[PDB]
């Protein structure tokens, strides 16, 4: 009897005569509530022994007492938010005030030098985008400062857009204010608080996108495409005229092939296929509106749809060297494309999907469909899978509910 100590959280054996316990299922150890007695503290409410008492206070001072604003303060606060045209004309000036001071990436041979740190401008940049709602990965603006071709184009595309924001006003703002201003009404939604809707992509709204691709140009130079795809396709809310719309629709599809998404590479290219031809087809931009909407199919393995778009690009646009080579690039896979044409053989090509299945993909011995099926955002243990009545699943033994015999079986209702 009584080999260890006398506390209930002791280590060795005990006896119920000498040291009579109260049967405490699971209590907290001497070093704090582990993650097992907290599975109750957030579901049961209190520790499962019942003896401990649920001091839920400092959470109440975390959520509620923080989120309390009386009625006579609620309606007035929004009248006190900042003028994000300012933290757009102030941060962009500060963001530059650091982007100028970031070291030129070293160039010593024998070993790749390490890119400059990013804590310098992470704080102002956090302000720029947070008002724009287009979140940029610091790597884009950390490899850009590193690349010898982009360290200057990027920084100066900021100095110039900063110019075309401290000269004009934040035009994607007024677009939201002119809603509250047009459709004749004496209410403009403030005096527009952005200077001193039927416009096209304004000056800034073009230079805004300008540095976004120049942001997304550092992404490709580091080859992180599916974050670049969130940079380009986010600027897609900034073009309202179909000239630049097709340009930025060419950028997104010029970043979806690498990113691995070969379906959306068509759509982003098919819009480049309906907005491109307005200019003289002699420049290398004329042909580009169609190639992506047909290269994305030479990448999607359906060569017969691709065999027609490169045909439709021949008629309109006279000679696009890229579109010309795809005409013959489709003659090397013949017949190995058309003879060997199965409807399902899709040999996954790039890394953007090789990487996106290392994450977000099913695993083995965990995260598979045999561990915890999720159903309506709620995790269900593998048994309770409403998408199968296979063995193990509790649906095998539901019954018939005293209602109609709906089964012909004998031992298996």
């Amino acid at each position: 009897y009584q080999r260890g100590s006398w506390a209930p959280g002791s280590k060795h054996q005990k006896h119920m005569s000498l040291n009579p316990t109260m049967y405490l299922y699971r209590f907290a150890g001497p070093h704090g509530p582990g993650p097992y007695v907290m599975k109750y503290w957030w579901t049961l409410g209190c520790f499962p022994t019942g003896i401990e008492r649920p001091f839920r206070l400092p959470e109440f001072l975390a959520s509620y007492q923080q989120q309390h604003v009386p009625i006579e303060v609620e309606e007035w606060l929004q009248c006190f938010v900042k003028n994000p045209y300012e933290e757009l004309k102030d941060a962009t000036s500060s963001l530059l005030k650091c982007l100028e001071e970031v070291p030129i990436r070293e160039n010593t041979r024998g070993y790749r030098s390490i890119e400059s740190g990013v804590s310098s401008f992470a704080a102002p940049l956090a302000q720029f985008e947070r008002q724009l709602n287009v979140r940029v990965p610091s790597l884009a603006v950390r490899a850009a400062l590193g690349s010898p071709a982009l360290r200057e184009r990027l920084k100066d595309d900021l100095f110039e857009y900063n110019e075309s924001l401290s000269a004009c006003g934040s035009t994607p703002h007024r677009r939201l204010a002119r809603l509250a201003f047009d459709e004749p009404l004496t209410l403009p939604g403030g005096i527009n608080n952005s200077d001193d809707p039927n416009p096209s992509t304004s000056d800034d709204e073009k230079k805004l996108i300008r540095l976004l691709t120049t942001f997304s140009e550092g992404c490709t130079l580091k080859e992180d495409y599916e974050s670049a795809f969130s940079l380009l396709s986010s600027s897609l809310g900034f073009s309202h005229d179909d000239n630049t719309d097709g340009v930025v629709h060419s950028n997104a599809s010029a970043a979806a092939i690498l990113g691995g998404l070969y379906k959306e590479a068509e759509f982003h290219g098919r819009q480049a296929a309906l907005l491109e031809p307005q200019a003289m087809s002699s420049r290398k931009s004329g042909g580009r509106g169609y190639v992506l909407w047909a290269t994305a199919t030479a990448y999607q393995e359906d060569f017969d749809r691709a065999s027609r778009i490169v045909e439709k690009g021949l008629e309109v646009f006279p000679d696009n060297a890229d579109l010309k080579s795809i005409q013959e690039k489709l003659a090397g896979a013949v017949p190995a494309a058309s003879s060997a044409s199965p409807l399902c053989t899709r040999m996954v090509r790039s890394k953007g999907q090789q990487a996106r299945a290392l994450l977000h993909g099913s695993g083995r011995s965990f995260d598979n469909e045999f561990d915890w099926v999720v159903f309506k955002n709620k995790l269900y243990p593998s048994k309770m899978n409403p998408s199968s009545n296979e063995m193990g699943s509790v649906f095998r033994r539901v019954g018939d509910f005293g209602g109609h015999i709906s089964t012909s079986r004998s031992l298996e209702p």
Binding site: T345, R346, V348, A357, G361, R364
Partner: protein, 55 residues
């Protein structure tokens, strides 16, 4: 037991192969050219393609 085990003696367990052949081993793998996830050779997906041909 007849005594306690000093640390140099609890590590003695980890010398032989029966310990390394149970914990400290890494499996050869590869991306299924279709299923796109890592895989061992022999065990296949559920997709009708990952299951008709056997990558």
């Amino acid at each position: 037991p007849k005594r306690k085990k000093n640390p140099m003696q609890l590590r003695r367990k980890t010398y032989g192969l029966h310990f390394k052949e149970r914990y400290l081993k890494l499996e050869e793998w590869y991306f299924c050219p279709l299923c796109a996830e890592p895989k061992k050779q022999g065990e296949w997906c559920r997709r009708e393609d990952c299951r008709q041909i056997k990558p």
